[PDB]
Ligand binder design. Structure first.
Ligand SMILES: N=C1NC(=O)/C(=C/c2ccc(-c3ccc(S(N)(=O)=O)c(C(F)(F)F)c3)o2)S1
Lengths: 257, 296
């Protein structure tokens, strides 16, 4: 269709403007990567509970990392930042966002409605209302259009892998959404069918397989280590029949790169 | 916010009330869109969130300019450039004389420009009707009201069904299609194009079935040749009267051969065969185009 190339070009611009500061965690005095991991895993569950789009999750993670790029947050307020970000993402992305009352209830009354509504206003202030961010998801949906024929296991697996990268800020904050999406597509394609990053996508993205290697090295490791990981919600989510049970598939032992 | 002196209410544009106001220090005339946050409600409305984030990246001469966002605990104001009137009112004032065609042609060309900018930045307007389109004294026309707008993905997902003001609503929404995209906005512009030409609304329905039938009565009831898949759409009924298509010479009499070509392309039943705003800009109807001034 008529706009696919323009939109890609423009999402490629925006991802660079929308990226968080890569080492912001080192300058956070209370919160850690493990804490951010526990929070993102929690939001996976919240999204499963409220039947939210994968996109809504991806957006929320973007808003959280950008918020924490410029704002020092104590551990006891991290979940408040996450909850207001989930709320904003939902209002942005969902046909039916959950109400503030349900957001308050899934935190088990850790925070008040007021506190959620006041964090919402802070997050919008800090993000200067710039909520429409490219995500690994958005790149992945476009890349799917280059698989012949459409393979639903490859699609579920690439998403599963794209979602795994959200949990771990070291190393994945280093990588743009379009890169993680390419690495995820390739890895999924390779695991399911033995195929590789297609020539049509090398042309569209300008990313050679080689250029994807650093992120693919990482993501292969994350895949291999996935059942051993302390955060397990994405793997649970991806056992269900709607995702063809792809988290139960065996990762490939080597990539040949 | 004490830098503004309110001049008058100039309407309730949808989910906000709009005021004309003046900056007391620079003298700038602005439109204010007041969005109350009650208290202990749902927070910032999802329509304000969308409108602001989408508008912040829709910077085009044919899209209304957001100048500021004033963000209190108690209230939320959007500050816009001020434009003279909306197209609905301009059209009502011209109900007797008629809009001159070089200006109809200028306005549509501009609308398509602003719309193509939206689409190529992954935005669906979803509410293009004459009252949401703004004009100034120097012959510019701009897209406004992005409250009902949406950042879309490639390929699209299912989005809200309750979308587009009935008269300007596309058949694929009315027939309950699972997916709609940018074509719903072209549809709306085609109806606006026709309305500028004939001085009245092309399809002024009062219920969904009535909106559909008026569409069918003008353009023919669609079949599988005209639109592969229609007879399989959720709200399609094989009992629909099968009306033949009206010649555009009766439909839109004041219009030339090029005018009819473009209009029929904007009103194609098949959303996939319906002309894009980019392709529309390249149509022979615009070979001739100038930038005339409105005649109040
Ligand atoms: N629905 C809307 N959303 C906006 O952002 C709007 C901004 C805006 C700027 C100027 C106007 C506007 C609209 C209608 C009209 S109207 N109804 O023609 O009176 C006018 C006025 F100048 F003529 F008074 C101005 O709206 S309107």
């Amino acid at each position: 269709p008529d706009y696919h190339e323009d939109i890609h070009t423009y999402l490629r611009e925006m991802e660079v403007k929308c990226k968080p500061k890569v080492g912001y965690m080192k300058k956070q005095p209370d919160i850690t990567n493990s804490m951010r991991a526990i929070l993102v895993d929690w939001l996976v569950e919240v999204g499963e509970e409220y039947k939210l789009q994968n996109e809504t999750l991806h957006l929320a993670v973007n808003y959280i990392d950008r918020f924490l790029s410029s704002m020092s947050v104590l551990r006891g307020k991290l979940q408040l930042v996450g909850t207001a970000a989930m709320l904003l993402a939902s209002k942005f992305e969902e046909i039916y966002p959950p109400e503030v009352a349900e957001f308050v209830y899934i935190t088990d009354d850790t925070y008040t409605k007021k506190q959620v509504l006041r964090m919402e206003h802070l997050v919008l202030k800090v993000l200067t209302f710039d909520l429409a961010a490219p995500t690994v998801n958005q790149f992945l949906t476009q890349y799917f259009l280059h698989q012949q024929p459409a393979n639903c296991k490859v699609e579920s697996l690439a998403m599963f892998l794209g979602e795994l990268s959200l949990i771990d800020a070291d190393p994945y904050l280093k990588y743009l959404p379009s890169v993680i999406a390419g690495a995820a597509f390739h890895l999924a394609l390779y695991t399911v069918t033995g195929q590789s990053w297609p020539e049509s996508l090398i042309r569209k993205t300008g990313y050679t397989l080689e250029s994807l290697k650093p992120c693919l090295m990482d993501l292969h490791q994350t895949y291999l280590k996935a059942p051993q990981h302390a955060q397990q919600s994405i793997r649970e989510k991806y056992k269900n029949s709607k995702y063809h049970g792809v988290s139960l598939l065996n990762p490939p032992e080597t990539l040949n790169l | 916010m004490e830098n503004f002196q309110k001049v008058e209410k100039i309407g309730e544009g949808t989910y906000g009330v709009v005021y004309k106001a003046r900056n007391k220090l620079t003298g700038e005339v602005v439109a204010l869109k007041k969005i109350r946050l009650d208290t202990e409600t749902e927070g910032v409305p999802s329509t304000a969130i969308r409108e602001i984030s989408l508008l912040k990246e829709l910077n085009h001469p044919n899209i209304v300019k957001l100048l500021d966002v004033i963000h209190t605990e108690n209230k939320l104001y959007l500050v816009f450039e001020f434009l003279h009137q909306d197209l609905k009112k301009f059209m009502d004032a011209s109900a007797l004389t008629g809009i001159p065609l070089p200006l109809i042609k200028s306005y549509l060309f501009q609308l398509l420009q602003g719309l193509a900018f939206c689409h190529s930045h992954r935005v669906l307007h979803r509410d293009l009707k004459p009252q949401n389109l703004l004009i100034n004294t120097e012959g510019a026309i701009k897209l406004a009201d992005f409250g009902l707008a949406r950042a879309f993905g490639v390929p699209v997902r299912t989005y809200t069904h309750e979308v587009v003001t009935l008269w300007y609503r596309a058949p694929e929404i009315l027939l309950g299609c699972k997916y709609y995209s940018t074509a719903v906005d072209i549809w709306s512009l085609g109806c606006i194009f026709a309305e500028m030409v004939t001085r009245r609304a092309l399809f002024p329905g009062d219920s969904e079935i009535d909106q559909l039938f008026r569409i069918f009565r003008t353009l023919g009831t669609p079949d599988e040749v005209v639109w592969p898949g229609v007879t399989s759409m959720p709200d399609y009924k094989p009992s629909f009267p099968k009306w033949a298509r009206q010649d555009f010479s009766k439909v839109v009499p004041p219009l030339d051969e090029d005018g009819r070509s473009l209009l029929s392309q904007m009103l194609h039943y098949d959303p996939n065969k319906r002309i894009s705003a980019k392709a529309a800009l390249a149509h022979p109807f615009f070979q001739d185009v100038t930038k005339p001034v409105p005649h109040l």
